[PDB]
Paper text:
To better understand how the small sequence differences in TMEM16F give rise to its distinct functional properties, we determined the structure of murine TMEM16F (mTMEM16F) by cryo-EM in Ca2+-bound and Ca2+-free states, both in a detergent and in a lipid environment. Both processes are controlled by the binding of Ca2+ to a site located within the transmembrane domain that is accessible from the cytoplasm and they are mediated by the same structural element located at the periphery of each subunit.
The equivalence of the Ca2+-free conformation of mTMEM16F with an inactive ligand-free state of a TMEM16 scramblase is evident in the low RMSD of 2.0 Å of a superposition with the Ca2+-free conformation of nhTMEM16 in nanodiscs. The conformational changes that take place in mTMEM16F upon ligand binding can be appreciated in the comparison of Ca2+-bound and Ca2+-free conformations. As in mTMEM16A, the absence of Ca2+ causes a local transition confined to the pore region, whereas the remainder of the structure remains largely unaffected. Besides comparably small rearrangements of α3 and α4, which are less pronounced in the nanodisc structures, the largest difference is found at the intracellular half of α6 (α6c). In the ligand-free state, this helix has altered its conformation in response to the loss of the positively charged interaction partner, leading to an increase in mobility of α6c as indicated by the weaker density. Thus, whereas in the apo-form of mTMEM16A α6c approaches α4, thereby closing the gap between both helices, the movement of α6c in mTMEM16F is directed away from α4.
Residue numbers in the entry:
A (entry chain B), B (entry chain A): 45 to 79, 90 to 147, 195 to 427, 447 to 490, 502 to 632, 646 to 790, 793 to 877
The structure:
Amino acid sequence: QDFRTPEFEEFNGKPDSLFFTDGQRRIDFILVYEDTNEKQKRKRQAYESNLICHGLQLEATRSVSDDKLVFVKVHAPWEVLCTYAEIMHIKLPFYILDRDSFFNPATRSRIVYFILSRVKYQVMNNVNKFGINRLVSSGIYKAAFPLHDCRFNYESEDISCPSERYLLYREWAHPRSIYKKQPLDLIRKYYGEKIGIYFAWLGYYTQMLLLAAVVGVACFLYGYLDQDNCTWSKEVCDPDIGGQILMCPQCDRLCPFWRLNITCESSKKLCIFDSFGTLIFAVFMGVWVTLFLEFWKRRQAELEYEWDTVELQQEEQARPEYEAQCCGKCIRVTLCASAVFFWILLIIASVIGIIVYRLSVFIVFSTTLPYLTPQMATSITASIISFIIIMILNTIYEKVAIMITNFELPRTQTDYENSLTMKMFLFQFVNYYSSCFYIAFFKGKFVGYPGDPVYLLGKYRSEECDPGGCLLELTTQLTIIMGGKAIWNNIQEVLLPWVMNITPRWEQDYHLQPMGKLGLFYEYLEMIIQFGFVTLFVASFPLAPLLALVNNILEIRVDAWKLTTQFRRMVPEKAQDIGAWQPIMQGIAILAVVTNAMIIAFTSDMIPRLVYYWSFSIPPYGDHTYYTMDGYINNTLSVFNITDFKDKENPYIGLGNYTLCRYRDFRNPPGHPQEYKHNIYYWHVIAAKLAFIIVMEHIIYSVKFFISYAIPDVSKITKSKIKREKYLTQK
Amino acid sequence: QDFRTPEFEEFNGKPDSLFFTDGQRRIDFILVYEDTNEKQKRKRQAYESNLICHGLQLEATRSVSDDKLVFVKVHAPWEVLCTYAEIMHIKLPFYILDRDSFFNPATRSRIVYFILSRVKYQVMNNVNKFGINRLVSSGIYKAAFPLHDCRFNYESEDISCPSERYLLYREWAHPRSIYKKQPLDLIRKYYGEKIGIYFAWLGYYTQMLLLAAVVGVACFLYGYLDQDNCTWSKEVCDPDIGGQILMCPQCDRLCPFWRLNITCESSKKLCIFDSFGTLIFAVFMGVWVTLFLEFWKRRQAELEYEWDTVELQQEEQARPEYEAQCCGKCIRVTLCASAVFFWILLIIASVIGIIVYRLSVFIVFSTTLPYLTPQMATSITASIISFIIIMILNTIYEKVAIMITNFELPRTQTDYENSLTMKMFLFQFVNYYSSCFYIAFFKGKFVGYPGDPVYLLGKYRSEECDPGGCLLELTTQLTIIMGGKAIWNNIQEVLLPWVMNITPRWEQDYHLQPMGKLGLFYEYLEMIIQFGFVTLFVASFPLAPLLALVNNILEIRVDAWKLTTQFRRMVPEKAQDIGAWQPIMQGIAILAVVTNAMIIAFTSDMIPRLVYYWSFSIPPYGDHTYYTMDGYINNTLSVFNITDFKDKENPYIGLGNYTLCRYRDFRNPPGHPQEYKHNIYYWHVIAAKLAFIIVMEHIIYSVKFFISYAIPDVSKITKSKIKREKYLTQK
Ligand SMILES: CCCCCCCCCC(=O)OC[C@@H](COP(=O)(O)OCC[N+](C)(C)C)OC(=O)CCCCCCCCC
Ligand SMILES: CCCCCCCCCC(=O)OC[C@@H](COP(=O)(O)OCC[N+](C)(C)C)OC(=O)CCCCCCCCC
């Protein structure tokens, strides 16, 4: 009730003062309020009473535009600065040249934020009810933000203070400054080591993506230049050889007998994407991943020394919702785990809907066709509809997961962000990569011969793949999803405000958007999901690091322009690493080695070509003299006489005027004793596929272990600097 | 020259005083010397001068038995105790009840050892030439040991001091106290947290080996009880079926045509060791390994809290050899790496000598035979000769590796122990497990059909395996090596001093053996090598954890009796973990998952039995009705008509009066078009083997990752104790 703030001067002489009316002390925080309201007014006055009794100097100012709002300028004198600096253990370099400039205003802002989080506001209905975040959650204060130095598109009128926001906008956040390196010490000094380590991680990720994109475009150029040497494509759309294959139908009855002449252009793309260049690129990408992780740990330790992020934390004060709300926690985490499991089953049901749509619209496209084949058109529209489902479901799960982790009770903001990180990454992982996993590993891998086809649930045959392989469909789906997400983000964040185009400093900072309690987390998530698209399916097509590099180069500058201009100034924090995203990245790495090996083995369909080249064109099995690839299509596809194993009994007879069809499997001809069991060539191919998985997995994992053992976790320059600062501190 | 020690009292009133002649101050160290000698005498007197000038109180005593030796009792007063306790940051619990008993004499001994390592002994030929270890390396002091409390087999005569060595011998080191648990706080308090963490690791290793041995003897009892249900053994030594197989010869000419009747007893053991019980045990042993590592990290963090081992280290003073001796370091480490690579190539040449011996003595045993077959006798004598070579080579490499790492120059004792650990573990690893790796993975796996056998170097055919499999020979080799090492250590350390069966305290402690600069390191190495025998080849036979448990139970007590009675009292040190042995153990774990999977797949020969049971006894391939195992031997072994592919041209004709032989491979009969290429059954078996490797490796590694994620790295009780001590220290 007593000890009100010093009353309003409201002079508004300079538009950007960043100082009190006496001009000798600097504003650190701004607290905004308005004026059943009498007890809240007593509450605010008691908070300011305990605030002045703690030692912070205060001032009021009524707003010149809207007289309901009152702005409270908060300054910390030097004494409480030294006491709470010794309390929270801030590392310092020494310079007593200016007491005001000894602490940069980021450090002053986090000191005043610690003081505002410690102050009790006298409400003892529940005893010891304290906090500034409780006041803005209760609504008696609207915000407790610090101030920006100046406008971004102008110069600070005060020549005393540095116009650091203008310098950061001119050198880092302008889109016509996209070529310059990020000034990382300015970003750290102005925004804290939680934002600075994010932008350092993003710049380093951009450099490693540049390396991977250079090697990927080299391998893709090798494939595109060596697309003429490929023999099986030239054989499959030779009209004499592939035109007379007469492939067996794919659906039950409503699909006609089709020839293998039609897939030529498809195979003319497919040899660019399943060649030896993609194998060399995936074997490179494993080593690139372990280089990425090891040099990230080196850069993280270098930032840990240089930005002194290991300073001692506080006791991690609980959330105001957890203080205001408080076997039960066990059934709560069980209920939220069952909810996220139910949502994962919903996205699996969406994938099954994509399968059923693929079958039905393939029948429709086949009957409406009389360039692009019906299979490629079916795959393209399926990928489009699928990606639209991905966008709808990830927005809906964003809202639902916010509500789910708000339903259960975490203790602090760290545990809240960790639980939200876990469930959000789990559904974003499954939601983005489940369709690609089904295309790569479970599409056409379980269908039988046309005499006894397999039925998944009855009346729906499992979808058959093209005789070249399902790698082109996986490439189409992956490119559609990744490019659609990149174009969606570059229309939402970049194109929208670009196509859209006196008062004091605190009033200008009020008319902005706060960053939120999560902050950079969502942005982090995008890159992590993008990381999986770089890493899990890199053998699908090698041009994914180039698209990721373009999206990352634009993402750095759109995050910079969002953070400098759009968002309010946040309280600077300390962070030694990115958080849970580094264990998530290591898990994605360890899984994606296996995923790349299984994409080259099962999906890419180059191991049958290698086995036919080395062991099946030889006089024990083939009529050729030496190792050669011609005659691959005629000796690969199995022959089927029309003898249904089975009650309709007419899948192919009603439209068939030819007695013999061919199909993509490795089984015996019908004249054989074991007429439709698996051939010796099938088991040769399967043994070679699993041997390739074992050899590539063990070689890549041993190389990654040896590289992680050979590269030190911290650089020699950083060890020398640590030794030098220890030796100078000891004296 | 000045400030000599206070002169000799030599009263020798009590045999165990552990106090000075005044009786108020406790002896902490004993420095022994004797008396071109004049400069060394001046050196010793200058060392004692700087010692008394630092503040330590000294006393001399001439020896009553041998008058050349002089014993110097070293006491630290309370002032220098507090100053150097604040210097080296010793954690304390508070009790000023006795100033002498505030620091236990282990802490007093390590304080006085720090002081003796800091003191400069005035020799400024090379400037600042300092250390106590330099004096005992130079020979002017013989030793600088602390004192034991009392005799082990008697009670201390002084009722003031606790007879802690007698209590430790009575409760921990006596072989008639083998059933009691180790008193770990007494071991830690008396011997430092370098010995205490070793014995805690050994006791915990014994408990986990007890668990693994219980499950292993359960699986072995399942195999031994279910040895009658096994069908292929009953078929192979049925005289009607296996007696008429007439297997094809193994060597070139001097091996006769042998029948498969002879292997019955061998197969009667082999079904005990390749059954489903060993597969279940290896799948269990992966989870047991990750449980071992996770609960070891939990116990290590619990000891880290309880024994405060994380206290701040000093600057890691260099070795006296490195101070006395000092592109060059690069060529030195290159030369020592080439030396250890040359020695590894020598042990590979010894393995090749074992191969050549196996072939030649199999010919000799086959010609001298007219129970045990010649193959089993050949394997047994080969394992005996091999194990003798292992013992000779590991002793010789122990001496050679000491000389090699003494040739190159490490800076400190930590780097010296790490380099010796690396090269010693590398050769002990290769030396112990190379013969077992060759038996499991490269024995009989590369031999062709008897028409075109393979020659490794010319005139020597690669050795063929028995049709049951090489798992019995691997079991024999593993049991011989492990039991021979255990019996060798229990004859050398245990049986030898057991079959072998006034003066002051410092004279009794002098007539002992010092522990050495390496200490427990060699003992550590044995358990680590034994750990590989528990882990890498556990699917060979499941009774290896039982033998390891017996050897570990005896090893705890022989290390206790060595350390309490035989060895001199060492200076207590601090250690947070075991050292390099924990990364070495994690590497052995990660390798041994793969090694167990490849032992079950390639060596165990149960995947051909499963494939014949499920897919080759069926009317597509077999004459049987349902899944059954009878007819495995007749339908498994390939048939060979005598048609040599090839200049001797008579390997089998000279002793052969039968036109048809059978051999252990999966190839076609001679009437086939592809007469001797690999069968469809071969590629089915190979694909099933590699699928088993992939499935078991990914399942075991995912289970190990999920268990390492599910179990916390530190216990909840230890977190509560850390919270409580932090909350009490904050007040
Ligand atoms: C861990 C993260 C991603 C896991 C993805 C699982 C991949 C599953 C692969 C699969 O379904 O293959 C099953 C069969 C069929 O072999 P394919 O060569 O696909 O036969 C169909 C191709 N063809 C129509 C031209 C004849 O192949 C086999 O019989 C070999 C089975 C080996 C499976 C190993 C999976 C690892 C499980 C932990
Ligand atoms: C990493 C630590 C330990 C590594 C140990 C390496 C193991 C090598 C296994 C091996 O040599 O097998 C080669 C062939 C032969 O298959 P087997 O079934 O052994 O044929 C001989 C058996 N038979 C006489 C009854 C007919 O089998 C194959 O063709 C499949 C080759 C797959 C090799 C995977 C090794 C991983 C290398 C990094």
